[PDB]
Amino acid sequence: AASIFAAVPRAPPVAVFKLTADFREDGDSRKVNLGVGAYRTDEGQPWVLPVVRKVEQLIAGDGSLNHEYLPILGLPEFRANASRIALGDDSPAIAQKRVGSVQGLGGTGALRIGAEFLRRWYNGNNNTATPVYVSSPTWENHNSVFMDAGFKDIRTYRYWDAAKRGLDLQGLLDDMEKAPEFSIFILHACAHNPTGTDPTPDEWKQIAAVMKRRCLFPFFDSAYQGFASGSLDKDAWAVRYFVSEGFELFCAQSFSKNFGLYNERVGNLSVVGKDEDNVQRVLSQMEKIVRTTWSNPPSQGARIVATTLTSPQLFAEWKDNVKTMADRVLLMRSELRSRLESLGTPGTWNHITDQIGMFSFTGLNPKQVEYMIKEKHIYLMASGRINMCGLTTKNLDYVAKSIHEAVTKIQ
Amino acid sequence: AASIFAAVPRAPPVAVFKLTADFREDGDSRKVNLGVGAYRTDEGQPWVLPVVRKVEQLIAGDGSLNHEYLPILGLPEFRANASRIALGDDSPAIAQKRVGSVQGLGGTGALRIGAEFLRRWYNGNNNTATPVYVSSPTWENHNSVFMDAGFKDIRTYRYWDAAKRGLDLQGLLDDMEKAPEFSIFILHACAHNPTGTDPTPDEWKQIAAVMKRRCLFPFFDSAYQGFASGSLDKDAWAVRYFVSEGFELFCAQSFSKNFGLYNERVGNLSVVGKDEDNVQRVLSQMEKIVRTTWSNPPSQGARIVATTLTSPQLFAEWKDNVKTMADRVLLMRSELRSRLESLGTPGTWNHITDQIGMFSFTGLNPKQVEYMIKEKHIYLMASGRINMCGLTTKNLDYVAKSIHEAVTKIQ
Numbered sequence: 001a002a003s004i005f006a007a008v009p010r011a012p013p014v015a016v017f018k019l020t021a022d023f024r025e026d027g028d029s030r031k032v033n034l035g036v037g038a039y040r041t042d043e044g045q046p047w048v049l050p051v052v053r054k055v056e057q058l059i060a061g062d063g064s065l066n067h068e069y070l071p072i073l074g075l076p077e078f079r080a081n082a083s084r085i086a087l088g089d090d091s092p093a094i095a096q097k098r099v100g101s102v103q104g105l106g107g108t109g110a111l112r113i114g115a116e117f118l119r120r121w122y123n124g125n126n127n128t129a130t131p132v133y134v135s136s137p138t139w140e141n142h143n144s145v146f147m148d149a150g151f152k153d154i155r156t157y158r159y160w161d162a163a164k165r166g167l168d169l170q171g172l173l174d175d176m177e178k179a180p181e182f183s184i185f186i187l188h189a190c191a192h193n194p195t196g197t198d199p200t201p202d203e204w205k206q207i208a209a210v211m212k213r214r215c216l217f218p219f220f221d222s223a224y225q226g227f228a229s230g231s232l233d234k235d236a237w238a239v240r241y242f243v244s245e246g247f248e249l250f251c252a253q254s255f256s257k258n259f260g261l262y263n264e265r266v267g268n269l270s271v272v273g274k275d276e277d278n279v280q281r282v283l284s285q286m287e288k289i290v291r292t293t294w295s296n297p298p299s300q301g302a303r304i305v306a307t308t309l310t311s312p313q314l315f316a317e318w319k320d321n322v323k324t325m326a327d328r329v330l331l332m333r334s335e336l337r338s339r340l341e342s343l344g345t346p347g348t349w350n351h352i353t354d355q356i357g358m359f360s361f362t363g364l365n366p367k368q369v370e371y372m373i374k375e376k377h378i379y380l381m382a383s384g385r386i387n388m389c390g391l392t393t394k395n396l397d398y399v400a401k402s403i404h405e406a407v408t409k410i411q
Numbered sequence: 412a413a414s415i416f417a418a419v420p421r422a423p424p425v426a427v428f429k430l431t432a433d434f435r436e437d438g439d440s441r442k443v444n445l446g447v448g449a450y451r452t453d454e455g456q457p458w459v460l461p462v463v464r465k466v467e468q469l470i471a472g473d474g475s476l477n478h479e480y481l482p483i484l485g486l487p488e489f490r491a492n493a494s495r496i497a498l499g500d501d502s503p504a505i506a507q508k509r510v511g512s513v514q515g516l517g518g519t520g521a522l523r524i525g526a527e528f529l530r531r532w533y534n535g536n537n538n539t540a541t542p543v544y545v546s547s548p549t550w551e552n553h554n555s556v557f558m559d560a561g562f563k564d565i566r567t568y569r570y571w572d573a574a575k576r577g578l579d580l581q582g583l584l585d586d587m588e589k590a591p592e593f594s595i596f597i598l599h600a601c602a603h604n605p606t607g608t609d610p611t612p613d614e615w616k617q618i619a620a621v622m623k624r625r626c627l628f629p630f631f632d633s634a635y636q637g638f639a640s641g642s643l644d645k646d647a648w649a650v651r652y653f654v655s656e657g658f659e660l661f662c663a664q665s666f667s668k669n670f671g672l673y674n675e676r677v678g679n680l681s682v683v684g685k686d687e688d689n690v691q692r693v694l695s696q697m698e699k700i701v702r703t704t705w706s707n708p709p710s711q712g713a714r715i716v717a718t719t720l721t722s723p724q725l726f727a728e729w730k731d732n733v734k735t736m737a738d739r740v741l742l743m744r745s746e747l748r749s750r751l752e753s754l755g756t757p758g759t760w761n762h763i764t765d766q767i768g769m770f771s772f773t774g775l776n777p778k779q780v781e782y783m784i785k786e787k788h789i790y791l792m793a794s795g796r797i798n799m800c801g802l803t804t805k806n807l808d809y810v811a812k813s814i815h816e817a818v819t820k821i822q
């Protein structure tokens with residue numbers, strides 16, 4: 001008769017990916033992709049890390065590997081090593097056998113499993129009322145992941161100060177001071193998406209004081225370790241500080257960007273609990289959650305990461321590759337800002353060099369963004385967020401001039 | 412003090428996987444792993460298919476490949492081809508452009524995405540009361556996946572007849588007759604897990620007639636296409652019959668077993684709708700579901716499959732590899748019937764031979780199973796379910812004997 005799907009509404013496509021598709025089909029020779037948060041070389045091309053290519057060849061020559069199911073929680077070598085990189089080899093948590101790790105389908109999969117676990121066993125039993133706090137603004141998928149896992153009350157914490165083009169520390173702390181005890185806070189470890197604005201170590205200490213006092217739960221999202229500053233240790237400062245202060249916490253780690261393994265979906269969920277027994281019990285429940293979601297994780301991506309992290313020579317080469325990407329972005333920040341300034345572009349552009357990681361929050365309004373896209377063929381998010389990795393020595397002038405036109409002629 | 416996880420109970424581990432862990436840990440030299448549904452050669456080792464081996468080399472040498480994110484719904488070439496394999500090249504549904512595909516994390520991931528979709532948009536909006544029927548017995552994860560998706564009413568339809576050692580057609584039909592309109596039925600496409608007993612085509616026509624009249628929803632679970640008989644076309648008959656009968660349905664395909672790609676998590680969810688518009692709207696919603704689960708799927712496994720399916724030469728080789736596996740199972744069944752029979756062991760064993768796929772529902776009760784596990788050192792499911800691929804020309808009698816004992820001694 002009528003289709004059983006007759007009343008199913010058409011949902012719009014996920015914005016960031018649609019932006020990419022639009023860009024790919026555009027035939028204008030001046031096109032620039034500043035949308036999705038992916039790394040690009042100075043030639044504007046994707047970059048498979050040299051260390052990755054190397055491990056890929058190793059893997060392919062190893063006739064000893066098979067394709068049998070991995071354990072539900074994931075590849076052991078991968079899990080242990082991933083958590084070690086996030087927390088540091090000398091972590092008190094590792095020494096005390098207080099850390100558990102669950103392999104996830106990229107950083108998103110790790111966040112999802114963590115959300116699912118909390119909804120069922122944290123702050124009660126099947127308590128969907130625990131508030132979940134996200135930054136204002138934050139990566140779109142945070143809200144969605146938490147709502148799909150079952151949470152009903154998602155709130156925001158002050159973060160970006162548009163007027164000042166910086167961190168609204170006072171409002172952030174105020175929102176935390178008034179958050180009900182046990183509330184869940186989604187925190188970006190470093191390289192905030194989409195602002196690029198991070199708290200300084202001194203500000204992080206203020207944040208942790210409130211959270212400890214009010215028993216707020218720190219759920220870190222770490223998708224850019226290394227990418228931010230070129231240093232794995234500096235980039236993990238916040239996470240390690242919380243661990244050292246004695247918090248129990250979760251850390252969703254992605255290897256999509258730091259390893260350039262986007263399409264292999266490699267992530268890890270680190271669980272830091274009070275003791276060994278508690279983490280083991282958490283893990284046992286997470287195994288049940290994974291079982292009904294993806295059953296067990298894929299191996300290719302995890303094996304590349306595990307091989308790299310366990311070999312001293314490969315590990316050193318990976319660190320170099322990561323620093324190459326971070327340095328490139330630094331260069332682009334400096335270069336764009338300079339151009340904008342010399343062009344006499346209205347406003348202040350120091351946020352361009354103050355910001356960290358892949359993104360910069362430009363301040364462009366929606367009509368100004370439309371202009372960039374429709375007229376200049378420069379693809380960026382509606383929020384005015386730009387991916388600095390899309391910038392090259394060859395397209396810098398064009399982009400800086402386009403921004404100048406947008407601020408001046410669209411106003 | 413007092414961890415936030417203090418009261419989180421220790422969950423029992425996933426049975427099948429636990430069984431493999433124990434096995435590996437066991438020291439007895441008579442060790443037989445008759446648990447997990449994974450193929451093994453006559454030498455009792457995992458088998459990476461030759462075609463997979465070839466494609467893996469092909470991939471590794473292709474320098475044009477990159478690791479940029481795949482579209483949310485999956486690798487286009489994989490999507491198209493996978494559905495083609497399930498429905499047939501000449502499928503009118505494919506010709507009418509009324510088939511949609513979503514790449515999933517193994518067959519489990521495909522089932523999960525389908526379940527999440529149904530719960531939100533089928534038979535009303537967010538109608539968690541729609542009954543979901545699973546066979547008696549079935550693959551344990553069926554219940555778990557649907558419950559996790561939000562469904563509260565999971566029922567069973569009669570299936571196995573312990574007395575006749577076959578399909579209880581009358582009970583099954585009766586269960587369908589009494590099922591409320593619009594109920595969801597989880598159907599095994601072929602090689603029923605765990606009984607190995609499938610309806611014949613005429614029995615399938617009878618099942619379909621009742622489903623059609625009562626508007627029952629067919630949710631096919633296709634994890635063994637090519638294993639029930641060694642022929643991909645034979646094994647897909649029932650799904651294709653339903654399509655030809657005009658049904659709207661879902662088919663969750665797994666490539667874990669037929670490609671031996673267990674650890675690369677390659678699956679596909681095929682959606683068959685009344686027309687293109689309907690399938691397009693369904694897919695738009697599936698995109699949002701995938702976004703919050705794994706974001707986008709991994710590439711390795713899907714690339715292997717797509718490459719295989721798109722090359723006539725590789726495709727023919729794959730078909731040969733699949734037949735090798737099927738034939739080897741037929742041999743073991745043939746044989747078993749022999750040792751048991753010829754060796755004066757009581758009962759009717761034409762079920763071992765009438766049973767199709769990896770599993771045989773033996774008959775061993777819990778204690779015989781325990782007998783078999785603790786003294787003998789033959790690991791198998793608690794149900795009496797044996798994995799034929801565990802048998803070999805050199806472990807044979809030691810296993811038949813064992814069963815002879817359990818049916819003699821310990822019963």
Ligand SMILES: *Cc1c(COP(=O)(O)O)cnc(C)c1O
Nearest residue numbers: 106107108139193223254256706
């Ligand atoms: C990229 C990103 C993720 C998701 O990473 P995947 O590995 O692609 O799932 C999560 N959080 C933030 C802040 C990200 O930038």
Ligand SMILES: *Cc1c(COP(=O)(O)O)cnc(C)c1O
Nearest residue numbers: 295517518519550604634665667
């Ligand atoms: C193996 C299997 C699945 C799921 O397979 P994966 O690809 O491992 O997720 C689903 N259903 C049945 C009946 C199976 O045997």
